[PDB]
Amino acid sequence: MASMERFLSVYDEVQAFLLDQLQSKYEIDPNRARYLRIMMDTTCLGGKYFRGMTVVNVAEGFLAVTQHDEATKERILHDACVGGWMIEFLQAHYLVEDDIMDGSVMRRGKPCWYRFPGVTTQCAINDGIILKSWTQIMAWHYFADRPFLKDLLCLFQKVDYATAVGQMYDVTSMCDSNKLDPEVAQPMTTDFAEFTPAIYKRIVKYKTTFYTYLLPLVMGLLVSEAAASVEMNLVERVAHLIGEYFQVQDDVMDCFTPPEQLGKVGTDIEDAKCSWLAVTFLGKANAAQVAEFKANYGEKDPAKVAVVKRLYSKANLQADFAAYEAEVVREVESLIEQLKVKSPTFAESVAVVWEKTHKR
Amino acid sequence: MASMERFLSVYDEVQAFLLDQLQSKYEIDPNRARYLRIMMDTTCLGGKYFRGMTVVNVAEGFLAVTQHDEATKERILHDACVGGWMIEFLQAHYLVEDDIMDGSVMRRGKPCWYRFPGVTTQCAINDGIILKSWTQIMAWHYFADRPFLKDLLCLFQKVDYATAVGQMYDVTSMCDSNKLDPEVAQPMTTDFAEFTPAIYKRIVKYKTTFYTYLLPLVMGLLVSEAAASVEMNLVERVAHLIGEYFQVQDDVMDCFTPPEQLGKVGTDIEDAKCSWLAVTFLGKANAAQVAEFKANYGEKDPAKVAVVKRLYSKANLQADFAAYEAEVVREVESLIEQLKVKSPTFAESVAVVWEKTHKR
Ligand SMILES: Cc1ccc(CNC[C@@H](C)O)s1
Numbered sequence: 001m002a003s004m005e006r007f008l009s010v011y012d013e014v015q016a017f018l019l020d021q022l023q024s025k026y027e028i029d030p031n032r033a034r035y036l037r038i039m040m041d042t043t044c045l046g047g048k049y050f051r052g053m054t055v056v057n058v059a060e061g062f063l064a065v066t067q068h069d070e071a072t073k074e075r076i077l078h079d080a081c082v083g084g085w086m087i088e089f090l091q092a093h094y095l096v097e098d099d100i101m102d103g104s105v106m107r108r109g110k111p112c113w114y115r116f117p118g119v120t121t122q123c124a125i126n127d128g129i130i131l132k133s134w135t136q137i138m139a140w141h142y143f144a145d146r147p148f149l150k151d152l153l154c155l156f157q158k159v160d161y162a163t164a165v166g167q168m169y170d171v172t173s174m175c176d177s178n179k180l181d182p183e184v185a186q187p188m189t190t191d192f193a194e195f196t197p198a199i200y201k202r203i204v205k206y207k208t209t210f211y212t213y214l215l216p217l218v219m220g221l222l223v224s225e226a227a228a229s230v231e232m233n234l235v236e237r238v239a240h241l242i243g244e245y246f247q248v249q250d251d252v253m254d255c256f257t258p259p260e261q262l263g264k265v266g267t268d269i270e271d272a273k274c275s276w277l278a279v280t281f282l283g284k285a286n287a288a289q290v291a292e293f294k295a296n297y298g299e300k301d302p303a304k305v306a307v308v309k310r311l312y313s314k315a316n317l318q319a320d321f322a323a324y325e326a327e328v329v330r331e332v333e334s335l336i337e338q339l340k341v342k343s344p345t346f347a348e349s350v351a352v353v354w355e356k357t358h359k360r
Numbered sequence: 361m362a363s364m365e366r367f368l369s370v371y372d373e374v375q376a377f378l379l380d381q382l383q384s385k386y387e388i389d390p391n392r393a394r395y396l397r398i399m400m401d402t403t404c405l406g407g408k409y410f411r412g413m414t415v416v417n418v419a420e421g422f423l424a425v426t427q428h429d430e431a432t433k434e435r436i437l438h439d440a441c442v443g444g445w446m447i448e449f450l451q452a453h454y455l456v457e458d459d460i461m462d463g464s465v466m467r468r469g470k471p472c473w474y475r476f477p478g479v480t481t482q483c484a485i486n487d488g489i490i491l492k493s494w495t496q497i498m499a500w501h502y503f504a505d506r507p508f509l510k511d512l513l514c515l516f517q518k519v520d521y522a523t524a525v526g527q528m529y530d531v532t533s534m535c536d537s538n539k540l541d542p543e544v545a546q547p548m549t550t551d552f553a554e555f556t557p558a559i560y561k562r563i564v565k566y567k568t569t570f571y572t573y574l575l576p577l578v579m580g581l582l583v584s585e586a587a588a589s590v591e592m593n594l595v596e597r598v599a600h601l602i603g604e605y606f607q608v609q610d611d612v613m614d615c616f617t618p619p620e621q622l623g624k625v626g627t628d629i630e631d632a633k634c635s636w637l638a639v640t641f642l643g644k645a646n647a648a649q650v651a652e653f654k655a656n657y658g659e660k661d662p663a664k665v666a667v668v669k670r671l672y673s674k675a676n677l678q679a680d681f682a683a684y685e686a687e688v689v690r691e692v693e694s695l696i697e698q699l700k701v702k703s704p705t706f707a708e709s710v711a712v713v714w715e716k717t718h719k720r
C-alpha cells in the first residue's frame with residue numbers, strides 16, 4: 001500500500017473511532033456528531049499533509065533497513081499514520097484559533113471555519129479546543145500499551161507549548177517590549193528596533209519549526225523505536241534551519257504571490273508583522289527609505305500598503321533571498337552529512353524533507 | 361502548616377518554575393514574562409480554590425490514616441497542591457475562552473481577561489491556550505517519576521475533553537438539534553422541546569461536574585495512591601449528583617442574585633440558556649405561560665427579560681427547588697453511606713465536599 005492511501009485510510013478509521021466513542025461514552029446525539037464530523041473534515045483535510053506524511057516517511061525509511069514480522073511493519077505504519085494525524089489535528093487547532101485571533105477571512109481558498117454561517121466564533125473557539133483534545137484521545141487509545149507512549153506525549157506537549165509561546169511572540173512582534181502591559185492598550189512600534197534577524201528567528205523557531213519540522217521528525221523516530229540512531233541536537237538544529245527557511249518563503253509569498261496560489265489575501269503589511277521582508281528591508285534601507293517604511297507600515301489603507309510593496313521591490317530583496325537560500329543550502333547539507341554518521345536512513349528522510357521544502 | 365497556606369505557597373513555587381523555564385529554555389524576555397505572570401495571576405487567582413483545595417483535602421484525609429515518613433507526608437501534600445493547581449489552571453483556561461466565546465463583561469467583579477486594554481481577544485485566546493499548556497508542564501515536571509503519572513494524565517485528558525464536549529452541548533442548547541448545520545446560521549428554538557431534565561443534565565454533567573467534582577476527588581485519590589480504597593462507579597455517581605446540584609444553584613443565582621454577589625450581570629435569559637429555571641418552568645407551566653415564555657425568552661430587551669423573570673417568580677420555582685434539594689440530600693447521603701463500605705475517610709471527604717456545596 002502506498003503511503004498516502006494508508007494515511008488517508010487511517011483518517012477515516014480515527015474519525016470513526018472518535019465519533020463512535022462520542023456516541024457510546026459521551027452521550028452525543030446524531031446531529032451534533034455530524035456537526036463534529038463536518039468540523040473535523042473542514043479543518044483537518046485539504047492541505048498537503050506534509051507534517052503527518054513526514055512521520056510516515058521517516059517510519060518507512062527505517063522499515064527498509066530493520067528486520068520485522070509483517071504484522072510489525074503494519075503496526076509501525078499504522079502508528080506513524082496515527083501520530084501523523086495527531087500533528088495534523090494539532091495544526092488544525094492552531095489554524096482555527098489563529099484565524100479567529102487574526103480576524104482572517106480565508107484559508108486554502110475557503111472561508112475560515114469561524115466564518116461558516118452555522119459555526120460563529122462562539123462555537124469555533126471551542127471546536128478548536130476539541131481538535132487539540134482529539135490528539136490526546138487518539139494517543140491514549142492507539143498507543144496505550146506502546147513503549148514510546150510517555151516519550152511521545154511528553155514531546156507532543158512540549159511542542160504544543162512552544163507553539164503557543166510562538167504565537168505570543170508573533171502577535172506581540174509589533175509592540176515595543178518595554179511597553180507590554182495588560183493594563184494599557186498597545187501602540188504599534190514607531191522605531192521598529194525589534195525587527196531584527198534574531199528576533200524574527202525567535203518568533204519563527206517557536207511559532208512554526210517545532211510543530212512543522214521537529215515534531216514530525218522525532219515522532220517518526222519514536223514510533224520506529226529509533227531515537228538512538230540519531231543525535232537529537234542535530235535533529236533540532238536541522239529542524240530549526242529548515243523551518244526558518246519555510247517561514248521565510250511564506251513571508252515572501254504573503255506579499256508577492258497572487259491570492260489564488262496562497263489561498264487568501266495576504267495582510268502581513270497591514271498587520272505590521274515582523275516578516276522576513278520587513279527585517280531584511282530594514283537591514284539595508286537608507287534613512288529616507290526607513291522613514292517612508294515607518295509612515296506606511298501597519299495601515300489598512302491600500303495606498304500605504306502599495307508604498308510598502310513598492311519599497312520592497314525597489315530594495316532588491318530577491319538578492320537578499322538568494323543569498324539567504326544559498327547559505328541555508330550550505331548549512332542543511334552540512335547537517336545532513338553530520339546525520340549520516342549515525343543514520344544514513346534518517347539523513348535521507350531529512351534530505352527528502354529539505355527537497356520538498358526547497359522545491360515548492 | 362494549614363492547607364491553604366501550603367496551597368498558596370505552591371502557587372508561587374509553580375509560577376516561579378514556569379516563568380524561570382520560559383527564560384531558560386524558551387528564550388523569553390523580561391517584559392513578556394511579566395505579561396504572563398500578570399495573566400496567570402489575573403486568571404488563576406481570586407476565587408475560593410474549591411477545586412484545587414479538594415485535592416489537598418482528600419489527600420490530608422488519607423494522611424490521617426496511613427503510615428508514612430514525614431518526608432512522604434510532605435511529598436504527598438506537595439503533589440496534591442500541584443495537582444490542585446492543575447485543575448485551577450484548567451478552569452482558568454475555560455473561563456478565559458468561555459468569556460470570549462460568550463462576549464462576557466465581568467467575572468468575579470472584575471473585567472474578563474480579554475477586555476483588559478493591553479490584552480484583546482487576539483492575545484486572550486492564546487493566553488487561554490497557554491493556561492491549559494501550563495497544566496501539562498506542571499504535571500511532567502513535578503510528577504515525572506511518580507507511579508500515578510500515567511493514570512493522572514489519562515484522567516486529566518478525559519476530563520478536559522468531557523469539558524469541551526460540555527461546552528458544545530451548552531452553546532448549542534438553544535438550537536434545534538435537527539437544524540445543526542455548519543452551513544446555515546442557527547435559529548433559536550421556537551418549540552423549546554429540547555429543554556428537558558435529561559437534556560439539561562447532559563449539558564451540566566459534561567460542562568461542569570467532570571472538572572469541578574470528579575477530577576478533584578479522583579486526583580486526590582491518585583496522588584495518595586488510594587484509588588483501590590474506592591468503588592470508582594460510586595465516585596462518579598456522587599460527583600455527577602453533587603455537580604448537577606451545584607449548577608442548579610448557579611442557574612438560580614444568575615437570574616435572582618444581585619450582580620454584586622455573583623460578580624456579574626446575569627444574562628442566561630437573554631442568551632436563551634437551557635437553565636434549570638427554564639426547564640423547571642416549562643415542566644409546570646400552563647399553555648398561556650408557555651406562550652408568554654416563548655415570546656419573551658432569548659431577547660436582550662430589558663422588558664422581555666423582566667417578563668421572563670416575572671414568569672419564574674409567579675411559577676413558584678422555589679418550591680420545585682426545595683423538592684430538588686431534598687431529593688439530592690437523600691441520594692448524596694445514600695452514596696456517602698455506600699462509600700463507607702470501602703473508605704470511611706474518602707466518604708468523609710465527599711461529605712465535606714457536599715456540605716461546602718450545600719451551605720453556600
Ligand atoms: C501557530 C500557527 C498559526 C498559523 C500557522 C500556519 N502558518 C500560516 C499562517 C500564518 O497563515 S501555525
Ligand SMILES: Cc1ccc(CNC[C@@H](C)O)s1
Pocket residue numbers: 454455458523527567568610
Ligand atoms: C466550561 C466552563 C465554562 C464556564 C464555566 C464556569 N461556570 C460559571 C460560568 C458559566 O459563568 S466552566
Ligand SMILES: [Zn+2]
Pocket residue numbers: 098099101102170
Ligand atoms: Zn496569526
Ligand SMILES: [Zn+2]
Pocket residue numbers: 250251254
Ligand atoms: Zn504567513
Ligand SMILES: [Zn+2]
Pocket residue numbers: 458459461462530
Ligand atoms: Zn459559556
Ligand SMILES: [Zn+2]
Pocket residue numbers: 610611614
Ligand atoms: Zn451560570
